[PDB]
Design a protein around this nucleic acid. Structure first.
Ligand code: MG
Ligand code: MG
Ligand code: MG
Ligand code: MG
Ligand code: MG
Ligand code: MG
Ligand code: MG
Ligand code: MG
Ligand code: MG
Ligand code: MG
Ligand code: MG
Ligand code: MG
Ligand code: MG
Ligand code: MG
Ligand code: MG
Ligand code: MG
Ligand code: MG
Ligand code: MG
Ligand code: MG
Ligand code: MG
Ligand code: MG
Ligand code: MG
Ligand code: MG
Ligand code: MG
Ligand code: MG
Ligand code: MG
Ligand code: MG
Ligand code: MG
Ligand code: MG
Ligand code: MG
Ligand code: MG
Ligand code: MG
Ligand code: MG
Ligand code: MG
Ligand code: MG
Ligand code: MG
Ligand code: MG
Ligand code: MG
Ligand code: MG
Ligand code: MG
Ligand code: MG
Ligand code: MG
Ligand code: MG
Ligand code: MG
Ligand code: MG
Ligand code: MG
Ligand code: MG
Ligand code: MG
Ligand code: MG
Ligand code: MG
Ligand code: MG
Ligand code: MG
Ligand code: MG
Ligand code: MG
Ligand code: MG
Ligand code: MG
Ligand code: MG
Ligand code: MG
Ligand code: MG
Ligand code: MG
Ligand code: MG
Ligand code: MG
Ligand code: MG
Ligand code: MG
Ligand code: MG
Ligand code: MG
Ligand code: MG
Ligand code: MG
Ligand code: MG
Ligand code: MG
Ligand code: MG
Ligand code: MG
Ligand code: MG
Ligand code: MG
Ligand code: MG
Ligand code: MG
Ligand code: ZN
Lengths: 114, 81, 97, 149, 60, 127
RNA sequence: UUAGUUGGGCACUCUAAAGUGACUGCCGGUGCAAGCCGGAGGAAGGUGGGGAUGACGUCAAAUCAUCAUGCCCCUUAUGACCUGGGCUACACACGUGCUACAAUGGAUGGUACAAAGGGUCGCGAAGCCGCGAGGUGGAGCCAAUCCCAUAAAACCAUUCUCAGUUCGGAUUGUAGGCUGCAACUCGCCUACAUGAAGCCGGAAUCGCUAGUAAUCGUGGAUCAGCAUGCCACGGUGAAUACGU
RNA sequence: GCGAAGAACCUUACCAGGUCUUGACAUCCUUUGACCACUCUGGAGACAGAGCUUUCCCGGGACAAAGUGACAGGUGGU
């Protein structure tokens, strides 16, 4: 519908949240400058009003655009031989978090108990 | 300086050790200033940065601008336990 | 229309000083308003009791400041002279406005 | 081994609306994190639902349910000969009401409706008709005592 | 290394944030209260002697 | 023409004043249903006027500060009970029978070092 | 009067010095007595609640690194100065905590009620600017006067409607804010985006007997900046004890 | 969540490299008595090199630069 098929039972804000690159306040601003209320469900949208939603969303980076941008951002750090590139390659915390214990979102589930 | 005081470069590193390497600039610069921001005019030269023991030579590329001079000289060594 | 603030670490010598000031002001002057007890202020200092170990064994010390306020309404030269010529005890701090 | 004897007992207050101590004990048993007002309003709303549906005052319905879910026999552990066995025992009045209220709240929190007022009201109505989760909890307790008599 | 430490702490630092505090009786760096300039141990013993005015053992 | 009482509960203190009238309760220059929007708190506040049969003969104007809303209500109740006690000596048994003249003495205890509260102790492990 | 503001008054709260008050003192039962169970009066009843207070001794218990000290070692170095790094490493195991796994809840709007503390090379108001962290501005204060200072849970409306979700917030990308000579290793905070595990936890194990446990915020020391830790303060406020 | 009531530099006791030797810190000795602070040049800094420079007071004293010991100095061990 709008880049992808957002849910049809929910409000417009919460459904728009399902697009990559749109959260909550960006959805509110979209529906604010799009001349559309936000308590109307997704089923009850018209064609012109949903078309204004489409027209509005073309000026924001969403889905593969952002994925390519962030992948290039990580790749540059990896390939200029920085510290953050080393951390990205080894799968260790990139910010200054401590790794003596308890860094599991990066290291995955607790590996082989030695 | 992560603010609007301007960027930070240590004066002894830049003043006439970087702006002075304009003619026949084909030699390394030894420095202990790990804390200096890599300016756009740093690019082309190779700087030797102290890591705690030794001077590691880093050749400033185009994508290193805005980073700290010490990001490219790791201090701790670790090889797979 | 004359303010005096007295502050000390104990209320006995300060009580004596305040009562003496009131007595002298009454003798050499005309009027005085009784000493108003301002709230005392206490500060607490918690310190580890051991020299090396033992976080859970501690000791509290405290420090209290006691205050009084006095007003003379009918100021006369004798009252001011007598009040300024008093010799209050050491440890009692006087402030005249 | 020490304990120096029987102790005093707590003295609860009658509820400001339904002038009974047992309503207060139910409200206390539903309390969480020292929030008296929330459970108190929840109980008032549940009794409103009861009065609306059944059509009679909620107090006699509540008393019928509690009389219908209070236990008589219970299983207690006895250690003899190096082995522990379950044995029958009879509850006092205080323990009788305590177990009744405990089971009522425990099995009212485990129902499947949207709110808590509805869950409490439905549990009470079920207990008033010898049906529900709290009713069977005292059925097996009667059963468990007999099988070890 | 203790007299050198005390002498360096007394000297004016190269930068303002270089400066730190030490107990004035024993040159101790940690646990220095700065109303008294005393570490906790010297504070306790001088308070027991009765040589810190106003302070007394707190019962409350 | 004014009967005065002072109530206290926890850190709350209330100046209750009682004047013949219609039944108008005033709390801090604010209405007593606007100040107290619940109902059981109003019941506990008007317990002293219900114990004796003098509920609607009086107006109470109160001035409370300190503590929280239940402390507000307890202080108000104690103050109005003492004011009624001032009105007539013969009210003394009834107000004593319900324990409405006792000033509640239990106040929040003291944090102790080595503990996380007044009595709560850290988690213990042998090894 | 925008207002306890101004006039005026200590009536009431409050502040703080000195007193009074509780002792099984009186009544009934029980006992040879001590004592035990109930009752009156009283704000308070059985050392009312809580602190400080740690006898004789035990563990060659801890600390030569707060301090001091016998003996033994170094003395162009085991002393002294400096810049950079490290104490923050990471296959893993244990201890103590914080945040959740949602409807007694999430988001949005409205709106009440504290105590104890800190402030002069310090606290820092109003007004203006910013989505926000903040910036600017300089009032009043050596303070029962002025500032920190918005209390938060609670309560009232609208919405969500049982969904790994309008739960949960880790992790990562970009743009910023402050302190500081300097924020890469390695500070804290903000905005937008991203949206992991997690459905109440196995054998087992811990705290707590009443304004306690549980839960919600607040202040302080250290401190240029940095706490989910420590030390204190109040708001709401239980269940149970047959027994050895 | 123990010393630590605050490890970016300092704290810091550890490591690498660069420097010092009556000494960073005390008493006495021998000459001088106010030395320090400041500007510029080199250096990562400690440190070196030139100028303006240091105003003790009433033989006393505490400060102060030079050279030399007697000595200092150890968060070194138990
Ligand atoms: Mg980095
Ligand atoms: Mg980063
Ligand atoms: Mg960290
Ligand atoms: Mg780390
Ligand atoms: Mg960690
Ligand atoms: Mg660690
Ligand atoms: Mg480590
Ligand atoms: Mg762990
Ligand atoms: Mg991580
Ligand atoms: Mg291996
Ligand atoms: Mg301390
Ligand atoms: Mg100590
Ligand atoms: Mg211990
Ligand atoms: Mg003790
Ligand atoms: Mg009990
Ligand atoms: Mg209540
Ligand atoms: Mg020493
Ligand atoms: Mg510091
Ligand atoms: Mg009023
Ligand atoms: Mg008011
Ligand atoms: Mg009024
Ligand atoms: Mg008003
Ligand atoms: Mg109060
Ligand atoms: Mg204590
Ligand atoms: Mg603790
Ligand atoms: Mg512990
Ligand atoms: Mg264990
Ligand atoms: Mg009082
Ligand atoms: Mg009695
Ligand atoms: Mg108490
Ligand atoms: Mg006592
Ligand atoms: Mg030993
Ligand atoms: Mg032992
Ligand atoms: Mg041992
Ligand atoms: Mg040992
Ligand atoms: Mg030694
Ligand atoms: Mg020693
Ligand atoms: Mg040690
Ligand atoms: Mg040692
Ligand atoms: Mg030490
Ligand atoms: Mg490493
Ligand atoms: Mg804790
Ligand atoms: Mg918790
Ligand atoms: Mg959320
Ligand atoms: Mg709200
Ligand atoms: Mg308030
Ligand atoms: Mg206050
Ligand atoms: Mg502070
Ligand atoms: Mg504050
Ligand atoms: Mg506050
Ligand atoms: Mg999921
Ligand atoms: Mg992160
Ligand atoms: Mg950083
Ligand atoms: Mg850092
Ligand atoms: Mg966000
Ligand atoms: Mg992703
Ligand atoms: Mg899962
Ligand atoms: Mg679920
Ligand atoms: Mg246990
Ligand atoms: Mg006990
Ligand atoms: Mg809690
Ligand atoms: Mg919370
Ligand atoms: Mg909090
Ligand atoms: Mg808390
Ligand atoms: Mg706080
Ligand atoms: Mg705090
Ligand atoms: Mg701070
Ligand atoms: Mg904390
Ligand atoms: Mg934090
Ligand atoms: Mg906590
Ligand atoms: Mg017991
Ligand atoms: Mg602990
Ligand atoms: Mg550490
Ligand atoms: Mg260093
Ligand atoms: Mg020696
Ligand atoms: Mg020996
Ligand atoms: Zn000391």
């Amino acid at each position: 519908i709008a880049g992808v098929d957002v849910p049809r039972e929910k409000r417009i804000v919460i459904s728009l949240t399902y697009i990559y690159g749109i959260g909550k306040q960006t959805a509110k601003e979209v529906l604010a400058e799009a001349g559309v209320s936000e308590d109307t469900r997704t089923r009850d949208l018209t064609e012109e009003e949903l078309g204004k939603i489409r027209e509005i969303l073309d000026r924001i980076k969403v889905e593969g655009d952002l994925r390519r941008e962030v992948n290039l951002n990580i790749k540059r750090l990896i390939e200029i031989g920085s510290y953050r590139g080393m951390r990205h390659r080894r799968g260790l915390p990139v910010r200054g978090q401590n790794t003596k214990n308890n860094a599991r979102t990066r290291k995955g589930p607790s590996k082989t108990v030695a | 300086r992560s603010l609007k005081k301007g960027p930070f470069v240590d004066d002894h590193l830049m003043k006439k050790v970087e702006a002075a390497a304009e003619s026949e600039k084909k030699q390394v610069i030894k420095t202990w200033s790990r804390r200096s921001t890599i300016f756009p005019t740093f690019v082309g030269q190779t700087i030797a940065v102290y890591d705690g023991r030794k001077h590691v030579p880093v050749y400033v590329q185009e994508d290193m601008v805005g980073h700290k001079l010490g990001e490219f000289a790791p201090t701790r060594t670790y090889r797979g336990h | 229309k004359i303010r005096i603030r007295l502050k000390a670490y104990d209320h006995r010598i300060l009580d004596q000083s305040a009562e003496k000031i009131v007595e002298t002001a009454k003798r050499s002057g005309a009027s005085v308003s009784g000493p108003i007890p301002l709230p005392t202020e206490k500060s607490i200092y918690t310190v580890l009791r051991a020299v090396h170990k033992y976080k859970d064994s501690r000791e509290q010390f405290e420090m209290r400041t006691h205050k009084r306020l006095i007003d003379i309404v009918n100021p006369t030269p004798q009252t001011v002279d007598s009040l300024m010529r008093l010799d209050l005890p050491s440890g009692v701090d006087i402030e005249i406005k | 081994m020490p304990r120096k004897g029987p102790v005093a007992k707590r003295d609860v207050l009658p509820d400001p609306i339904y002038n009974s101590k047992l309503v207060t004990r139910l409200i206390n048993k539903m309390m969480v994190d020292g929030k008296r007002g929330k459970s108190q309003a929840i109980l008032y709303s549940a009794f409103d639902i009861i009065a609306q549906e059944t059509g009679k005052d909620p107090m006699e319905v509540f008393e019928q349910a509690m009389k219908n879910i209070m236990p008589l026999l219970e299983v207690k552990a006895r250690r003899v000969g190096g082995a522990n066995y379950q044995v029958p025992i009879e509850v006092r009045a205080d323990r009788r009401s305590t177990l009744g209220l405990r089971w009522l709240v425990n099995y009212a929190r485990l129902r499947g409706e949207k709110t808590m007022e509805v869950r409490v009201a439905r549990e009470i109505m079920d207990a008033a008709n010898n049906t529900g989760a709290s009713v069977k909890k005292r059925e097996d307790t009667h059963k468990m005592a007999d099988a070890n008599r | 290394a203790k007299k050198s430490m005390i002498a360096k702490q007394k000297r004016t630092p190269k930068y303002a944030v270089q400066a730190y505090t030490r107990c004035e009786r024993c040159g101790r760096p940690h646990s220095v209260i700065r109303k008294f300039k005393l570490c906790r141990i010297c504070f306790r013993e001088l308070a027991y002697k009765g040589q810190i005015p106003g302070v007394k053992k707190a019962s409350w | 023409v004014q009967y005065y009482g002072t109530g206290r509960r926890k850190s709350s203190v209330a100046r209750v004043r009682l004047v013949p009238g219609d039944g108008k309760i005033v709390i801090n220059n604010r209405d007593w249903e606007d100040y107290i929007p619940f109902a059981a708190l109003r019941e506990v506040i008007k317990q002293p006027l219900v114990a004796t049969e003098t509920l609607g003969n009086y107006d109470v104007l109160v001035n409370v500060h300190g503590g929280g809303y239940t402390g507000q209500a307890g202080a108000i109740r104690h103050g109005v009970a003492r004011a009624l006690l001032q009105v007539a000596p013969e009210y003394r048994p009834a107000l004593k029978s319900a324990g409405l003249l006792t000033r509640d003495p239990r106040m929040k205890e003291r944090k102790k070092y080595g503990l996380k509260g007044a009595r709560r102790a850290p988690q213990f492990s042998k090894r």
